[PDB]
Design a protein around this ligand. Sequence first.
Ligand SMILES: COCC(=O)Nc1cccc(NC(C)=O)c1
Ligand SMILES: [Cl-]
Ligand SMILES: [Cl-]
Length: 182
Amino acid sequence: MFYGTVSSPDSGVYEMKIGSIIFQVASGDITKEEADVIVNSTSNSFNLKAGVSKAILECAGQNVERECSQQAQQRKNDYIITGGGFLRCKNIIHVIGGNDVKSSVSSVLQECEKKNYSSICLPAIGTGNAKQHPDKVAEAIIDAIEDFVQKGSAQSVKKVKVVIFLPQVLDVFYANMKKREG
Ligand SMILES: COCC(=O)Nc1cccc(NC(C)=O)c1
Ligand SMILES: [Cl-]
Ligand SMILES: [Cl-]
């Protein structure tokens, strides 16, 4: 229906088309990535400093931490959008690691279209302190992209990359891609 073939354009990187979007996975440090949006998997108070969130908030800087607590004390947010600070992005989207991962990724995609952005980089959302299972997280991330494509919503978004802290979790994402392959 939408899925292309799984291949490797670089050592340790795996990709496939999902409609007009190139979907990629790799292991490494997400704070070294460049993309229009980088996603942070945080807590419901937007101030977690454990797992990948520690590295993202430290590298982003204190002006970003204050955007987070200022917005947190304004309304009940499901996610928040901040500046990039010292990360190589235009915005950070902070999602709640314990929330439904398909819902969180759908919201990220919609917000990126609203800004006419082309590239997104995210971690394996919820696999840190939220302790969601890696298989369920992989299934949810890829389902969200499939649904966005199916609805004809992808216009500006062309590349979605998951940069994963543990190589063992990358293996789970690769297997999920091969299950879907066209
Ligand atoms: C030494 O461990 C540092 C670390 O980041 N661990 C770690 C381990 C497993 C998953 C995740 N992921 C997220 C989203 O936080 C992080
Ligand atoms: Cl998490
Ligand atoms: Cl991760």
